[PDB]
């Protein structure tokens, strides 16, 4: 059965905007009230929608459980910009990793797609309001995010200004792995989507 979005954008639904188990295809119309609850941008959006309009099947799976972050705080990163029940919250499908006891060890994490289907994977970077917020959330002043796939190599540096998040996506082929490395400002994937063309 096809997913007909109301009031919410594809971007918003994929990331799991709080303000918003198998589907054939997804269509968002039009000029949705809720896009990204935390201010930001969704890169290569039109390209993704074009891709998502041609898929026969769409399924959400957990690839990196929230509980697997023992060295970082996976729940307390929340914003009043993304409220739930009157209190601060965040996107349900990606994780706002923040420092734990004023420490943010370097993250090196890989997930290999052993499914038989392509996986749509999403992640993000936080560009903090100012230098104080940078150390408050991530402790490390100078930070980076590296993302790699057999076909993809991305390196991000947070621009410190007004705070925004920037979200990215890729298609992870079967038997190909995605590799994340970061010492801060990383909005990590928890859930990904099996898609079939």
């Amino acid at each position: 059965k096809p997913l007909i979005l109301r009031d919410c954008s594809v971007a918003g639904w994929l990331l799991g905007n709080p303000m918003c188990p198998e589907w054939s295809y997804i269509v968002e119309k039009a000029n949705p009230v809720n896009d990204l609850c935390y201010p930001g941008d969704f890169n290569d959006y039109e390209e993704l929608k074009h891709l998502l309009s041609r898929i026969n099947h769409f399924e959400k799976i957990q690839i990196i459980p929230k509980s697997s972050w023992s060295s970082h705080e996976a729940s307390l990163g929340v914003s009043s910009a993304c409220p739930y029940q009157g209190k601060s919250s965040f996107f349900r499908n990606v994780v706002w990793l923040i420092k734990k006891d004023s420490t943010y060890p370097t993250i090196k994490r890989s997930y290999n797609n052993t499914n038989q289907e392509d996986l749509l994977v999403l992640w993000g970077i936080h560009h903090p309001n100012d230098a104080a917020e940078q150390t408050k959330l991530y402790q490390n002043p100078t930070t980076y995010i590296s993302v790699g796939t057999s076909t993809l190599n991305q390196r991000l540096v947070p621009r410190i200004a007004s705070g925004r998040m920037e979200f990215f996506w890729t298609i992870l082929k079967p038997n190909d792995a995605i590799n994340f490395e970061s010492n801060g400002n990383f909005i990590a994937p928890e859930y990904a989507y099996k898609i079939v063309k």
Partner: antibody
Amino acid sequence: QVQLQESGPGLVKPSGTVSLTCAVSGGSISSSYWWSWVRQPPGKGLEWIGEIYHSGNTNYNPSLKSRVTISVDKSKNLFSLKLSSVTAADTAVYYCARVALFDILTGGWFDPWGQGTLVTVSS
Amino acid sequence: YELTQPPSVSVSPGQTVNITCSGDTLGDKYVCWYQQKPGQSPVLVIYQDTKRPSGIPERFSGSNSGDTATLTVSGTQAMDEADYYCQAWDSSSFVFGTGTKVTVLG
């Protein structure tokens, strides 16, 4: 600017019930703020009692939870406190305050505060 | 969750005073500070660790690191004599510090 105003009985017998209301001016109860009660026994520190949202959702201090109730009236733009089974330990100045959430992380700050009202529990 | 403060500090007029507030992993939490004079309501002087509300003089500043948050008052005046409370949030509850009486020596 927003102002808050407490009112209610200033004298209460032991085992009785402290009953207060907070009138909100210059601003609406229906907003993104939380509405809180705080008390201060004379010569002592501030103690958080609890809070409420315009939706009716509440959070209470675990030590007062059994004997405390907070409610909200949206049309009258006020919220109220009921503290039952009171003893001398419940004698204090009671404050209402508006709570705003941080842009990021959990918690928030109290502003403005009401003028406070003294409630004495004594027979 | 507890927030511990020194019961009292004193400072000469024009000098700098530090009021400290400590608690487990306090550096991960945003802390706010309140000034309270006898017979008056608390007044917010610092929120979100460092921010000053409108109308609060520049000589009030705050910082938070490790397990300790600090309210700093420089060029302290007589009118700054008050009780000061830190405040944070832990596990569904707001918590106020035990309070510090600040005396401006006259």
